[PDB]
Amino acid sequence: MHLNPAEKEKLQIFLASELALKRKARGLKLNYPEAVAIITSFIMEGARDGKTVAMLMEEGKHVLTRDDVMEGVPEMIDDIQAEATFPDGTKLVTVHNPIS
Amino acid sequence: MHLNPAEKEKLQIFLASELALKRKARGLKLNYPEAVAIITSFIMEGARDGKTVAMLMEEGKHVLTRDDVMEGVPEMIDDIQAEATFPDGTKLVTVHNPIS
Amino acid sequence: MHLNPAEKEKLQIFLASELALKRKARGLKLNYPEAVAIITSFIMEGARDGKTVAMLMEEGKHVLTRDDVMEGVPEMIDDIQAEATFPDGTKLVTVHNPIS
Amino acid sequence: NYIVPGEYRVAEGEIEINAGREKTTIRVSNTGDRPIQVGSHIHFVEVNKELLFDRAEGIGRRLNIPSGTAARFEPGEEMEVELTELGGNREVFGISDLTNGSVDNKELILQRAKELGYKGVE
Amino acid sequence: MKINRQQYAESYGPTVGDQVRLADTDLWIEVEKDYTTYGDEANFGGGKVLREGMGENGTYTRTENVLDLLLTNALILDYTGIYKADIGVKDGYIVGIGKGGNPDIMDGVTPNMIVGTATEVIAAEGKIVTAGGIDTHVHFINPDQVDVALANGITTLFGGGTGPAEGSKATTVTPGPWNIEKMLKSTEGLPINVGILGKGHGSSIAPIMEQIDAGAAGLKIHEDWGATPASIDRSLTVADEADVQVAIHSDTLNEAGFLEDTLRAINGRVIHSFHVEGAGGGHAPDIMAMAGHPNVLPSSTNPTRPFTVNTIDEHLDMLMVCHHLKQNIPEDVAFADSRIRPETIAAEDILHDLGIISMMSTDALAMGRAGEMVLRTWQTADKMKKQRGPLAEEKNGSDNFRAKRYVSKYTINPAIAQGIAHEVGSIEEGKFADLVLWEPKFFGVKADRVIKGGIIAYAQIGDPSASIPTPQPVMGRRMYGTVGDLIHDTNITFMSKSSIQQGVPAKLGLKRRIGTVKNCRNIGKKDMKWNDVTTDIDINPETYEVKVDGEVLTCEPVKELPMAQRYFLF
Amino acid sequence: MKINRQQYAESYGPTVGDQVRLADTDLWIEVEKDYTTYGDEANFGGGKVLREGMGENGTYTRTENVLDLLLTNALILDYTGIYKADIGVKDGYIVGIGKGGNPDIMDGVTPNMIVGTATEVIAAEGKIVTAGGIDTHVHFINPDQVDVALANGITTLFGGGTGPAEGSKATTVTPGPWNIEKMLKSTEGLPINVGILGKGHGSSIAPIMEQIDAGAAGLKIHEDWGATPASIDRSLTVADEADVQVAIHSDTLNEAGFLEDTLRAINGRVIHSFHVEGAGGGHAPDIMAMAGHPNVLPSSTNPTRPFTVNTIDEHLDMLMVCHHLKQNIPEDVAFADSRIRPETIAAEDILHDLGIISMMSTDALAMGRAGEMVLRTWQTADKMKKQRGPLAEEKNGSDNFRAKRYVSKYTINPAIAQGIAHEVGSIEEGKFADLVLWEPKFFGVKADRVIKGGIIAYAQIGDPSASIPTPQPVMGRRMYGTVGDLIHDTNITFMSKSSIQQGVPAKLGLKRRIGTVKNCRNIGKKDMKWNDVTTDIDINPETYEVKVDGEVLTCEPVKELPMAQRYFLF
Numbered sequence A, B, C: 001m002h003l004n005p006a007e008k009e010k011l012q013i014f015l016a017s018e019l020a021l022k023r024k025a026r027g028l029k030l031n032y033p034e035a036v037a038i039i040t041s042f043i044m045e046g047a048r049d050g051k052t053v054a055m056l057m058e059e060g061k062h063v064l065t066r067d068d069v070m071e072g073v074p075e076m077i078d079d080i081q082a083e084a085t086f087p088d089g090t091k092l093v094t095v096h097n098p099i100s
Numbered sequence D: 001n002y003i004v005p006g007e008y009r010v011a012e013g014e015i016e017i018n019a020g021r022e023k024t025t026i027r028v029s030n031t032g033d034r035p036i037q038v039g040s041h042i043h044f045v046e047v048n049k050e051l052l053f054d055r056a057e058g059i060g061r062r063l064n065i066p067s068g069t070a071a072r073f074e075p076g077e078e079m080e081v082e083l084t085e086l087g088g089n090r091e092v093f094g095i096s097d098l099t100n101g102s103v104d105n106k107e108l109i110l111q112r113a114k115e116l117g118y119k120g121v122e
Numbered sequence E, F: 001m002k003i004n005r006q007q008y009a010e011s012y013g014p015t016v017g018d019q020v021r022l023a024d025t026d027l028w029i030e031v032e033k034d035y036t037t038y039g040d041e042a043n044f045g046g047g048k049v050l051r052e053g054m055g056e057n058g059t060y061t062r063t064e065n066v067l068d069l070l071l072t073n074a075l076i077l078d079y080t081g082i083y084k085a086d087i088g089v090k091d092g093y094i095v096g097i098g099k100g101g102n103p104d105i106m107d108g109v110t111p112n113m114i115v116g117t118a119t120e121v122i123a124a125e126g127k128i129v130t131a132g133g134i135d136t137h138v139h140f141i142n143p144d145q146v147d148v149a150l151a152n153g154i155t156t157l158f159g160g161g162t163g164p165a166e167g168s169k170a171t172t173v174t175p176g177p178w179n180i181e182k183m184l185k186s187t188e189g190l191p192i193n194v195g196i197l198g199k200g201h202g203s204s205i206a207p208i209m210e211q212i213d214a215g216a217a218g219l220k221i222h223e224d225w226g227a228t229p230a231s232i233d234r235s236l237t238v239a240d241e242a243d244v245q246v247a248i249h250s251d252t253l254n255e256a257g258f259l260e261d262t263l264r265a266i267n268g269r270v271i272h273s274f275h276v277e278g279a280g281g282g283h284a285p286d287i288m289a290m291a292g293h294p295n296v297l298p299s300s301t302n303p304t305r306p307f308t309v310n311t312i313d314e315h316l317d318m319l320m321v322c323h324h325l326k327q328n329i330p331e332d333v334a335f336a337d338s339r340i341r342p343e344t345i346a347a348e349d350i351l352h353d354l355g356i357i358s359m360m361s362t363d364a365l366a367m368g369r370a371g372e373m374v375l376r377t378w379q380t381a382d383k384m385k386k387q388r389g390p391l392a393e394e395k396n397g398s399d400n401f402r403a404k405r406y407v408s409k410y411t412i413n414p415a416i417a418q419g420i421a422h423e424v425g426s427i428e429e430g431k432f433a434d435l436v437l438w439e440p441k442f443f444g445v446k447a448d449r450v451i452k453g454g455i456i457a458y459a460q461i462g463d464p465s466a467s468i469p470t471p472q473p474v475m476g477r478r479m480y481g482t483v484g485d486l487i488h489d490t491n492i493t494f495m496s497k498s499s500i501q502q503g504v505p506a507k508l509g510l511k512r513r514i515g516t517v518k519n520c521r522n523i524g525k526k527d528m529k530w531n532d533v534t535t536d537i538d539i540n541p542e543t544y545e546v547k548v549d550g551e552v553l554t555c556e557p558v559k560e561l562p563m564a565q566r567y568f569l570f
């Protein structure tokens, strides 16, 4: 596979996102690390799909809403940042105030 | 996400439990580490759901039965212990003789 | 669970294979590490199922085809090697030119 | 009773910066063709040569703006700024090498400014 | 020119009278005073104050009142106050608390807090800064425990053990000269401050004392080695000669004595009473009465902190499985029922709030959680505010008095108990620069950056392959203070005076900073900051009812805690 | 007996005239010459040539012209040529490039390249071998950054920082004697070569110079510390006395001057201009004009490399969030728009292709990617071939001229700029054996094996529990060169002449190889290999149009790059 250090670390984000999505599916309000994991994995999968940085800046604000997360979690998350390999190489995505 | 060392380690248990559940779904009798992973992940997800320590001590004895696991595995597992964050903070669950 | 170093490392292959299978399911042509992960996890799950080394040498050539992967990926993968615990203990599987 | 973790409850009132120091308003012009942004704590006489203002009125002074903020001058832009007095020992070293000592040495500062072509030595 | 207070606090952190919520608790801390000069605040970055000829002095060499590091705009939470200041560090020590910058141009600069060519900058605006936690009940069982501790803001581990040997799994003991030497060598690789306890057991002085001369920093008396009148007496005789502290886990079984017999053996000498509530160990059922005595320095361990609806079920089962007790053997059930008591656990919450229990600690990996001493201190303070109200001593609607009482329990009080408060345990000039920065939203839960000896040792930081340090995944990671030989200069090995005089560090090749244990034998309860109450504690032998000043101390368990499921992935 | 060329290349790697594709790019390199004697090629294994009495000499002791290591059948890609040779290493240095084996029986053996009893063998047949990359813009923020760098073939990190402190997060600076000493000690544990930059800020010589005497290898001038005429002047006065290099991130804000004022302060002295395009920092909008001057050694940082459809969106947002800029504050938007310019980023691609920008670098964790300097160099060369065609200087349909121009940017040119090219930066006899083996299919993406000081430090290798090393999972892993004391002998700490003369290594207990920085003050643009062009660069202040020789330099961004989604899991 030839995994480099970042590829090994970022597998953890996907795994945490899978865990969080199972918790959401059984009706739980998500906590701070669950919410971050879901939005982060969404960004990295979007890059893999070949979306633009600008599409993901927009979409990342609509992945989770206030009624998906516990009290205070929207206000704890000022942004979420992720780097992934786009068709044009690694880029940084920053999602501002992802949960309104 | 701000993962601490325990949160990183415990992602591994969930992953091993997902692996074991896929092996069980395709008809395999589970082995010792598979059985432990499934029961452990069940306990940690129960805490996340907001069950009590006493509910999980009872439920953990009914997650896998003798006919789910290979010969000798019930007698190899004297107990399974896990710590997780309950609504009232971290607690230890011990499941005694989880597989009869 | 009593995980040894190899068991911990090999959980990563299963996780990468799950990631790659989700990318394939949403219609993406797979890349080099995705393709390797899928075929590797297939081999290790085959051993767990109790298939022979010779069955897996044959089957591993039919897990992914040219139209599942990006241009050049078939020619990048000369073989895939994996060790897993068969009913008769650890064995090495080598799949030659897995993607034609 | 909605809990925002770590939130502030600030007291009433306002914070007066540079309290008790003399304030001076001056007009400043960016005569150059590239933008110039000036921080709160640069000795004002030592700014970019192409800013035209009465250089004597920048001696011993800096911008009366919140600590860590900056005034921006677009190419060709003229605007008024408010200055406050430097404090502490009222000495400046380095920056443009116009002072290298007390800010009281107005004569010497302006002679160096004029020789090096800092605009507005009057 | 005036700045609105909301905007001021967003740019520079809070100032006098402003309040800040601690994590998702009900606890509010208020800025008591501020060392700044408004308009001359220090800050670092593009077009900011700390630039050459401006807020950075370009003249002075490092020796000339210049700092190695300035923490700008810190909100300090410490036994000494809750206040706003810059913190200056030099040669790995706190040298100045006040106002940093450049006296050339700024008013109010503290004279030894010059920002110069030699100065690094950490922005602490909007952070809470505390001393590193001092955990005095550590079992050295699994080296992975060190990162767990750093992640929750602990910087000093005092205790014992050789790894997962049964003696170590039960007791905070590194026994004898050879095991002590081996663990002092191991310590060279641990990125945290350390002190080692020897076995406080023997009927002759020499086998106990040779541990102190070998490099132990104190002793542990534990019932599993025989917490007998003789072992208690010989250990305190050694401790009084050697100037080190003795910790005790007393005879739960009352085999050779009841509590009054243990106190007679102690004979008025200073002692640190571990897990004084007694679920973690001690004379059944009345050990917690120790906390009323003037010669006792009393600590709790953390799993009883605070009293929750799962506490008893979790403890009874934990005790039964760890002691190999059988639910169908009546003596085993009677023992468990005598040791795990809702009456004493509930009263323990109140004794913390009243300043009668002075310290917290973990009992890491024996009966306690390496990374939850700080966490559970604040959960306890929060539960007490909800159930008892603001303390009578509070003003302005703040919880400052409670916050100073509780921060003292895991910073300065353990350091005083152990004889190490000359080096660590508080943000004061002249002490080692062990500092923890917290985002208020994560206060007491997950540390932002842990500074050890003036260099970051541990941080919550992101992808090492990224363009910037904040992209996911953000997790706790060892920083450059832990790497190569810098681990030696950023951490202290605390040792007895006698081992230092005898040259043990040179004999073993220890390269770490060597800290001297001292001034542990002529202290008492009165020396515990904000937690100095002596009183008659009565524990009813039939009902386990706790009384203080004829008042029954009872309290309800809670179903939910802050600093819990909002934060943790598991 | 004759061998078909396809079969020859499969067995021994390519020979004269054969071409090899670099990864999944359009770039082809051609073997220019071959040192072998056909039929006497060296190879190792069962029934192979390097056996006692055959291709291995059984007579000579190690001192007698015998190698410690032979890399057989390497395709070298270097500023000195693209050619086929054996590489011989001894005492951790490259001692021979030519033909290895046994003069007893083989023709054409290079006299000091005897394979003897003492010789290890690495098979390089079918591999491309390059010098280790030299990254001269490193922020030391997160120690996990070192493996990221090794995995993409970087072997030397020059820069500064103390971990995730705000000064370090912005600037390549280890400030002052104490922080420098602490980071030199930290370096003992980092498995890569290192040089530390001090703070290039001050109005007096002594506070700057004391950093050089403490063990700094150079200085960094950064606008966040005040990139003033005084700081520039004093730093270059120090550098000229000390024989170290100065890097500059100029005054973006034009606060104390425009570019012409910075050049007047420099006064013709040598300087390394970091991120010369200016997205990473510098006089807005015209800093990139620095790259035309004969006394400037100009580097790019990597996120602008090359110009893609996501570049501007990604940079504008990155700058706004990292500077805490608000989208509704017009001065913040004007600043961002003045700094992030498609006109200068597009022209930067062409200035690389023309040899006007001489070097690449990362800006690791401040505004750049630790593991993408090599990656993005080749993506840029590939994009330029697609858009501009083969360079006029090419022959035989190969891209050899472009490949030498581009490999120079991250190997020899940074090494010359820093004063360390006597030790590192190229595959030449007499230089340290820092070598990177690449499978062509992964060239510039993932290194196969990274050799440091003649021992493998890092490798892509599989399951450590397997019968053989290739079974999954194959990932980057630290090898024996990083373990125990061998980390000292395989890596170099680069230091000033003065710190070496003053005995800093012995004072601090440094065990690493000590490299001397020298010959940095009487070089210029003309000394940059294949990248030596001086010219008048005009940047239009209204349109940001770049002209060179009256020609507007414009270029389109691309939607896709090679060395991207075929390779990476994320």
Ligand SMILES: *c1cc(O)ccc1O
Pocket (backbone or CB within 6 Å): E169, E170, E321, E322, E323, E366
């Ligand atoms: C196992 C080991 C200990 O040290 C304590 C308790 C159990 O169950």
Ligand SMILES: *c1cc(O)ccc1O
Pocket (backbone or CB within 6 Å): E350, E387, E388, E554, E555, E556, E557
């Ligand atoms: C606990 C303690 C008090 O003092 C009062 C009430 C509870 O529940």
Ligand SMILES: *c1cc(O)ccc1O
Pocket (backbone or CB within 6 Å): E468, E469, E470, F169, F170, F321, F322, F323, F366
């Ligand atoms: C955070 C930290 C930096 O150092 C840079 C940018 C952000 O967003």
Ligand SMILES: *c1cc(O)ccc1O
Pocket (backbone or CB within 6 Å): F350, F387, F388, F554, F555, F556, F557
């Ligand atoms: C870029 C550069 C050139 O020289 C020509 C064309 C593009 O797109």
Ligand code: NI
Pocket (backbone or CB within 6 Å): E249, E274, E275, E280, E281
């Ligand atoms: Ni105990």
Ligand code: NI
Pocket (backbone or CB within 6 Å): E137, E139, E170, E171, E172, E363, E366, E367
């Ligand atoms: Ni204990």
Ligand code: NI
Pocket (backbone or CB within 6 Å): F249, F274, F275, F280, F281
């Ligand atoms: Ni820069």
Ligand code: NI
Pocket (backbone or CB within 6 Å): F137, F139, F170, F171, F172, F363, F366, F367
């Ligand atoms: Ni930089």
Ligand SMILES: [O-]
Pocket (backbone or CB within 6 Å): E170, E249, E274, E275, E280, E281, E363, E366, E367
């Ligand atoms: O204990």
Ligand SMILES: [O-]
Pocket (backbone or CB within 6 Å): F170, F249, F274, F275, F280, F281, F363, F366, F367
């Ligand atoms: O930079």
